[PDB]
Amino acid sequence: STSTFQTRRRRLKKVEEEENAATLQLGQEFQLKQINHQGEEEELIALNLSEARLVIKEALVERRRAFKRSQKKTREKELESIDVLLEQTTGGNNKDLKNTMQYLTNFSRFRDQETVGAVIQLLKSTGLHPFEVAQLGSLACDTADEAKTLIPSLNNKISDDELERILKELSNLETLY
Amino acid sequence: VGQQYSSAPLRTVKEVQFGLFSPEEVRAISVAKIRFPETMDETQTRAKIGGLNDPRLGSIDRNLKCQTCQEGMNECPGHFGHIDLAKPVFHVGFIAKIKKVCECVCMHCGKLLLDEHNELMRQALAIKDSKKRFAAIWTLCKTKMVCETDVPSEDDPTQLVSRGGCGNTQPTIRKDGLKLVGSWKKDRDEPELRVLSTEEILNIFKHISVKDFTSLGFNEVFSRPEWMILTCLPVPPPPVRPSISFNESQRGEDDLTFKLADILKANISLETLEHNGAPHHAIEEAESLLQFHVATYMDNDIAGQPQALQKSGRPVKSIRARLKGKEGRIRGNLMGKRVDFSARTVISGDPNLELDQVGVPKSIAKTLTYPEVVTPYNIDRLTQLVRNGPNEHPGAKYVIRDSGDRIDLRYSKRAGDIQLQYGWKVERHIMDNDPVLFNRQPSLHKMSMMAHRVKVIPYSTFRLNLSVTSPYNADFDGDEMNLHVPQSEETRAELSQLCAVPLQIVSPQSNKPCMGIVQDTLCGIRKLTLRDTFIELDQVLNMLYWVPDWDGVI
Amino acid sequence: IFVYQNNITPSAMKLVPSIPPATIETFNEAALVVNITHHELVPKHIRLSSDEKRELLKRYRLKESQLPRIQRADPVALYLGLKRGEVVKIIRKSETSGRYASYRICM
Amino acid sequence: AGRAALYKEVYNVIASDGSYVNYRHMALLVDVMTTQGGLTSVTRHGFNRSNTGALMRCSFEETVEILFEAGASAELDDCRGVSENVILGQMAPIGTGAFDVMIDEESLVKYM
Amino acid sequence: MFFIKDLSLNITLHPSFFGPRMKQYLKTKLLEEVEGSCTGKFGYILCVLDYDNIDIQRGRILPTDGSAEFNVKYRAVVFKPFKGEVVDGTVVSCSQHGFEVQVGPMKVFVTKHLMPQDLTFNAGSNPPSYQSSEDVITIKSRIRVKIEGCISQVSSIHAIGSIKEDYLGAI
Amino acid sequence: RLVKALEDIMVHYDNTTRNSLGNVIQFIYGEDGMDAAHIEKQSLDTIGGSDAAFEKRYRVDLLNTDHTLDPSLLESGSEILGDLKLQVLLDEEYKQLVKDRKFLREVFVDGEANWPLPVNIRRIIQNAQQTFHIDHTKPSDLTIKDIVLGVKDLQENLLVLRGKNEIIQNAQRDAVTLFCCLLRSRLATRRVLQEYRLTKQAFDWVLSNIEAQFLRSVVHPGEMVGVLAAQSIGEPATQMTLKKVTSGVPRLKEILNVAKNMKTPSLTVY
Amino acid sequence: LKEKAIPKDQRATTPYMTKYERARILGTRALQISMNAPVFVDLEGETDPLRIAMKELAEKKIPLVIRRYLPDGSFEDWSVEELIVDL
Amino acid sequence: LRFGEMERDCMIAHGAASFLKERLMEASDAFRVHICGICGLMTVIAKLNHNQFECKGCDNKIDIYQIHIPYAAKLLFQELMAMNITPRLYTDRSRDF
DNA sequence: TAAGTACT
RNA sequence: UUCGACCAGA
DNA sequence: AGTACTTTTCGGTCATT
Ligand SMILES: [Mg+2]
Ligand SMILES: [Zn+2]
Ligand SMILES: [Zn+2]
Numbered sequence A: 001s002t003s004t005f006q007t008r009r010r011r012l013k014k015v016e017e018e019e020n021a022a023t024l025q026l027g028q029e030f031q032l033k034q035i036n037h038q039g040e041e042e043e044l045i046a047l048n049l050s051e052a053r054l055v056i057k058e059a060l061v062e063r064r065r066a067f068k069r070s071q072k073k074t075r076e077k078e079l080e081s082i083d084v085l086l087e088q089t090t091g092g093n094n095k096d097l098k099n100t101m102q103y104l105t106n107f108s109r110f111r112d113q114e115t116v117g118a119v120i121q122l123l124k125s126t127g128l129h130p131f132e133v134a135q136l137g138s139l140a141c142d143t144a145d146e147a148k149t150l151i152p153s154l155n156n157k158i159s160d161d162e163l164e165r166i167l168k169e170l171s172n173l174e175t176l177y
Numbered sequence B: 001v002g003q004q005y006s007s008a009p010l011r012t013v014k015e016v017q018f019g020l021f022s023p024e025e026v027r028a029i030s031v032a033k034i035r036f037p038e039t040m041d042e043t044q045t046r047a048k049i050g051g052l053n054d055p056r057l058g059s060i061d062r063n064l065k066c067q068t069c070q071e072g073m074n075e076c077p078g079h080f081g082h083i084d085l086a087k088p089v090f091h092v093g094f095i096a097k098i099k100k101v102c103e104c105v106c107m108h109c110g111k112l113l114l115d116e117h118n119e120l121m122r123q124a125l126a127i128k129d130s131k132k133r134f135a136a137i138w139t140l141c142k143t144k145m146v147c148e149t150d151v152p153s154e155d156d157p158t159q160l161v162s163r164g165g166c167g168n169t170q171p172t173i174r175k176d177g178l179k180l181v182g183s184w185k186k187d188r189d190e191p192e193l194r195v196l197s198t199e200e201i202l203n204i205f206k207h208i209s210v211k212d213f214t215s216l217g218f219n220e221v222f223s224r225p226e227w228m229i230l231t232c233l234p235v236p237p238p239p240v241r242p243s244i245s246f247n248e249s250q251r252g253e254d255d256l257t258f259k260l261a262d263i264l265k266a267n268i269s270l271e272t273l274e275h276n277g278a279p280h281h282a283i284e285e286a287e288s289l290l291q292f293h294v295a296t297y298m299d300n301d302i303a304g305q306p307q308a309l310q311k312s313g314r315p316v317k318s319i320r321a322r323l324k325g326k327e328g329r330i331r332g333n334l335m336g337k338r339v340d341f342s343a344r345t346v347i348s349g350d351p352n353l354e355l356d357q358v359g360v361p362k363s364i365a366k367t368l369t370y371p372e373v374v375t376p377y378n379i380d381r382l383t384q385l386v387r388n389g390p391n392e393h394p395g396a397k398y399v400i401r402d403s404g405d406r407i408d409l410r411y412s413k414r415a416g417d418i419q420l421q422y423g424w425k426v427e428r429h430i431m432d433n434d435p436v437l438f439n440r441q442p443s444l445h446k447m448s449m450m451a452h453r454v455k456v457i458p459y460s461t462f463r464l465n466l467s468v469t470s471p472y473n474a475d476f477d478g479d480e481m482n483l484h485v486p487q488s489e490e491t492r493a494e495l496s497q498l499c500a501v502p503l504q505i506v507s508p509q510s511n512k513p514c515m516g517i518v519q520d521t522l523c524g525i526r527k528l529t530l531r532d533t534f535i536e537l538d539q540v541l542n543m544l545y546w547v548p549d550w551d552g553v554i
Numbered sequence C: 001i002f003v004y005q006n007n008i009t010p011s012a013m014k015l016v017p018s019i020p021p022a023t024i025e026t027f028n029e030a031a032l033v034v035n036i037t038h039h040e041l042v043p044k045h046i047r048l049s050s051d052e053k054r055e056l057l058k059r060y061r062l063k064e065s066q067l068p069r070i071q072r073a074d075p076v077a078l079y080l081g082l083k084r085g086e087v088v089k090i091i092r093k094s095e096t097s098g099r100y101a102s103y104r105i106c107m
Numbered sequence D: 001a002g003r004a005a006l007y008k009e010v011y012n013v014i015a016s017d018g019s020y021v022n023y024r025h026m027a028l029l030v031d032v033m034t035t036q037g038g039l040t041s042v043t044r045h046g047f048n049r050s051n052t053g054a055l056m057r058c059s060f061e062e063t064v065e066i067l068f069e070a071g072a073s074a075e076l077d078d079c080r081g082v083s084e085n086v087i088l089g090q091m092a093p094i095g096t097g098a099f100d101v102m103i104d105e106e107s108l109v110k111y112m
Numbered sequence E: 001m002f003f004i005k006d007l008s009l010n011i012t013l014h015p016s017f018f019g020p021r022m023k024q025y026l027k028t029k030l031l032e033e034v035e036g037s038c039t040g041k042f043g044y045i046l047c048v049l050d051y052d053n054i055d056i057q058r059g060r061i062l063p064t065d066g067s068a069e070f071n072v073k074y075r076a077v078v079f080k081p082f083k084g085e086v087v088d089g090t091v092v093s094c095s096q097h098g099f100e101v102q103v104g105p106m107k108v109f110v111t112k113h114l115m116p117q118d119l120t121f122n123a124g125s126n127p128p129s130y131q132s133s134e135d136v137i138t139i140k141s142r143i144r145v146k147i148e149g150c151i152s153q154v155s156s157i158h159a160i161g162s163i164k165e166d167y168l169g170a171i
Numbered sequence F: 001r002l003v004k005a006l007e008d009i010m011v012h013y014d015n016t017t018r019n020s021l022g023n024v025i026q027f028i029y030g031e032d033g034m035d036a037a038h039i040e041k042q043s044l045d046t047i048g049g050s051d052a053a054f055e056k057r058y059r060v061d062l063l064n065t066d067h068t069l070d071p072s073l074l075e076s077g078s079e080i081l082g083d084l085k086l087q088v089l090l091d092e093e094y095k096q097l098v099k100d101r102k103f104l105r106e107v108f109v110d111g112e113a114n115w116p117l118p119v120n121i122r123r124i125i126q127n128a129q130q131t132f133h134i135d136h137t138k139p140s141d142l143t144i145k146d147i148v149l150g151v152k153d154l155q156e157n158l159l160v161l162r163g164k165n166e167i168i169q170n171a172q173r174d175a176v177t178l179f180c181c182l183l184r185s186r187l188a189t190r191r192v193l194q195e196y197r198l199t200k201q202a203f204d205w206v207l208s209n210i211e212a213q214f215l216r217s218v219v220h221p222g223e224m225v226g227v228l229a230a231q232s233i234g235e236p237a238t239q240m241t242l243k244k245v246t247s248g249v250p251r252l253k254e255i256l257n258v259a260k261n262m263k264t265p266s267l268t269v270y
Numbered sequence G: 001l002k003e004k005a006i007p008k009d010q011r012a013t014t015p016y017m018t019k020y021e022r023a024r025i026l027g028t029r030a031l032q033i034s035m036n037a038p039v040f041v042d043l044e045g046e047t048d049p050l051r052i053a054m055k056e057l058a059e060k061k062i063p064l065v066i067r068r069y070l071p072d073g074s075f076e077d078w079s080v081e082e083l084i085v086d087l
Numbered sequence H: 001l002r003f004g005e006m007e008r009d010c011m012i013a014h015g016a017a018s019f020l021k022e023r024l025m026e027a028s029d030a031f032r033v034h035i036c037g038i039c040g041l042m043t044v045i046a047k048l049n050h051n052q053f054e055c056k057g058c059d060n061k062i063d064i065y066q067i068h069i070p071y072a073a074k075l076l077f078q079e080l081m082a083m084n085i086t087p088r089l090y091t092d093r094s095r096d097f
Numbered sequence I: 001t002a003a004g005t006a007c008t
Numbered sequence J: 001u002u003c004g005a006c007c008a009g010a
Numbered sequence K: 001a002g003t004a005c006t007t008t009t010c011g012g013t014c015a016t017t
């Protein structure tokens, strides 16, 4: 299959598979405390759309490059620009990635690696948990209610005013179209 | 091995975790209710009833079905079934402990009989060795027969401290057949003998403490004392107790398949008593019968005589019996097996082979085969062997292609045809210089088995060189010997690089060479030496020609 | 160290391990008439500092259990009086290489 | 000193016959018999009781008797024993198998 | 919600490919058996990051066939919806039992009776839709759903979501 | 039995003898780490022999007309006589050969000086001999420093164990001691020049070979010595076809059983 | 696991290749060669795998790595290249 | 013919590792079974087609291994199980050492 | 055959 | 197949 | 403590189930 950096000693009685809810209780495979290859610890990695769009593109790109060192031996405008990056460094039969790029590129909220950076620098002062610090980034929210309700894991973790300021600076950073 | 690809990753066994089946597990695992004791005949109609063997379990009659698991016969190992007993029964082999455990704990409350409070016990609780704590613990409390409620702590013998309660005197216990009985001493006089019902024992155990298990040689997850008593009985699938058909309209059932049949019967009969005219204790006359069968099925060579003879007086192969040393599974199936690619005949000496050779008779060379992989290096040679056929000597008798399918060279309408494919295998005949393992039993030497060079020769005998005689310890008064044929490019290596006779010449068992010169060659090597003995030209010339490595310098 | 003559009463001996740290040992006369360590066969043993031991282990990557053992009541174990855990280094002659170094832990 | 005797005596049994065995062998055995603590006998009584796995002892003199008390005390077998593997159909860690082999991708390039 | 988890996989290479650019082939295969895969414990594997510093370590030769087995350690972008997770996607299919929204690589389905009431279902529409007082839901229409529950299956994941709470519906 | 009792024993890569538990059974296979196969009965010359004859052979005194190497043997014969800095090495040597003597006599009390030892030295020289057509006539060309200082440099390379520390490297010395006694026995100045007229060439050769040869006689971590040792004993047990002691087969049986009531009990008091 | 991996330095095992090692390397390599694996030496006309192996093994052109495990579990890694081949 | 106990001990002596296996597996028994990565048993209901794997009870479908062991050994195990004893087959050591 | 434990 | 007997052998 | 019991100790034939 594809094991995951943490040999959990299963001693016969596998029964306690908790629920998966926005009680910030994600499968054991997504605790806030997971392990890095080097063997070190590291916070979970939560990607809000458009921030993901950038990580993928960024690797799918730098792939086409090292895919040629060896070779020798605007919204609607990016759809076409990405389709190619696939039909060059993708399996082509990865119908998921195709569909993940449309979506990921259609509902995205940022175009500059400089804009997504500030978004992060911003939300990363909240002390909030990765999963929230994601939704907040990928979901439009005008009120503290639209937020503290579509992300019920927040509720008591931040004053509505405060969370309302954040929401302000987001629509202010939200790149146009 | 097994054939048919499986998307399941493949690993090697690293640990073997020994445990005891928990009734609850046994149930979960099973795929068969197993209520009927009969075999098949849905009223003579041939098939199999959802009763015993295949109420969803494995199969027979060469028919896929193994719970859709298909694959059929070869590939579908068995699928345990179960059979909910009537009343708890002992485990013929555990009786020993089950008993030695009670003697370690008192009923009613079910708890140890010596806490950290008794010092002699302390020492027995530091010893880290399941086999040893439990061997010392037992020796300590097998004597005390009063579940003390108040004992003198680490201070004054005057002051008495408390712990668990219920002084209910502890009965000593003895073993009569398959039941445990004990006497309770009453003071004022005279004993009180009563049979310890399994139902009862089982219970006292169920209540033994979590730390109490462990303290006594056990394991909370894999082996709780309470499991030594059978509540649910796993039902081995056909492949453990296969049949034997003489075509059709006959039988062929296996010993085991009968003891289950009995166990089953004896179980039901019980059941229909506790829900009918139950003359209370005219039942425990038929509950002993179950304890019996479910006992004898596993072990049938006990002390309490009754061999459980099967109509005709034949003993009955208990499961135990199948593993018992030599001639059986462990020692005679696993530690040692019958194998393929092997031959044996009569050995005779031949003063014309080099030491490291072994004359193999064409007969065999044409029978024994070595799987070679079609390679550009050989394509040619290989295709020729194939063509040649399986009757001519240097030839082959089986070509196998990537598509995991065997081409039988002696029948196949294409024998003459066929162009090999790099990657195919062409089981060919053993050929001059195919390293083989030769051997003469009893093998009690590294040397009793050495690698030789195959030299295909006429006539029917393994012809070995003389000097390699004393190592195998063989004569030719009709002595036979075994030959084994390697199979992987790397297997050969292991023979040729470590077992080759030239290598065995000097032995560590006595830091001196282990083969020399005998009979003629020796007796004659002396005569040929003597000052007195001279040789003239004509002959000294022939003698020279004979040493193959003569520098041609008379 | 207490040297008895013909024997000690089973009522007395059960008073030795009642005052730690200190320790006591019981030796019979008839057993001390000759020193066993002087015997042709018995090679010389040696105690090891809990420093020298924690070493032996580290240098061989041994766990306490994989070490050869000597009996808590072994004649020489008494002569030197080891303690459950102490390691003795046994050095003897050898018909293969002059001297051979061996180690015996205690149980 | 006991080892010293146990050996001496065993040596003699093989000398009386006018045969010869290199120290090391008789030694090893005489040693296996001793280390543990005292005089461990070469019999189902002794050695086949040691901490060795189950499956291993399982194959000599007590089999089932042994297996039974194995799962009843939930033992765990290392599978380091020659036997252990032979019973599993795996390559025992023995000579040819006392180590592993790998394709060093690095060195697999300098070669060309 | 989308993640970047650290994973590993074992590939069994046939001696055949014990070439010069083996590394190359390995990686290549890594990707054949991952990008596009699916699990319940990882969900949708979408893209292997840092194609270049992929750790192969020394692979060990098996022992009956020269095939070698390397533990290719890597890192990639994953995505496994959860229950109670709010996401917006484009509708795809729409019937008389509800419409199905497509949140990324996955398809979340909303039941007719898991929506509001003032929202009925218009059959004789082209293309098929769901009408309201001021709202209208059909194909391309973007929706924001609340995934009530997840159901893993084969090489995909489905889930049922609702639009009956607040701040849920069209946009 | 013997077998089943020692299956699991083999020499591990640390050059230790263990079983499936990792229980050291021998710290160095056979108390020397040598593979039985590479061994022959040699004679430790330093052992037997009258205290008198021992001198006449290994003793060299550069400060004496009658106890020095006659210049007919060494090339720098006459220019040595008297030198005091050499007579120190030359004396160091002798004090050692002597330390040796006593040592052996403490190990092999019987006086028996023939023992199985890796590296057949006798022959290794025998070849050195007729390989360089060495003439028992003309004088050598070895420095007394040449000899003594190279024989010392040899012992440093006869490595059985390797370890980078004291406890280990201390074992090394141990599992080599006996061999070296045999070594110095045969590579003593006097001997090296008077008995087997070696030249520098010869000697530097005889050395190189002993090293390599030795290094080959070690034991290969991998050997399943247990089963070996078992058989090596149990094999000649079958061949046993049969002063009033208990005897062979029945006795061996008596031994492996560790029986409390042995037929013959005896006990020899000197 | 890397605490169980010993550095190329501090290394302690035998500098020379054990008889079983080479025994196996040759076999192992032979096997692979017979599988149509790449050969790193010009076949001087050879055509037998174990024969080609023996050759590869002499020009020490064998891309294999012998990992030596120790009683406690920690191992050492050597290369056919490194290992001396006396025998 | 028969590669009995003694014939084994011999190869063991020889250090002829792989050869020993080849005799024991490939040229005899050799069988392929499926295990539960949870409860080391033969339970696994492998449909080796629709790749379904399951193992209700320890209830799996995900963590499943496949192994090669002498059929006789499979049997040994099944036989032991029939005797209510559980021999767990684990593909990874967790007791270190 | 003959010995060794466990068992009566 | 299984038990058992015999054998026959080296 | 004495007596009985158990284990362990590489081909074809016949007869009965
Ligand atoms: Mg004969
Ligand atoms: Zn099936
Ligand atoms: Zn009580």
Ligand SMILES: [Zn+2]
Binding pocket: H036, H037, H038, H039, H041, H043, H044, H055, H056, H057, H058, H059, H060
């Ligand atoms: Zn399971």
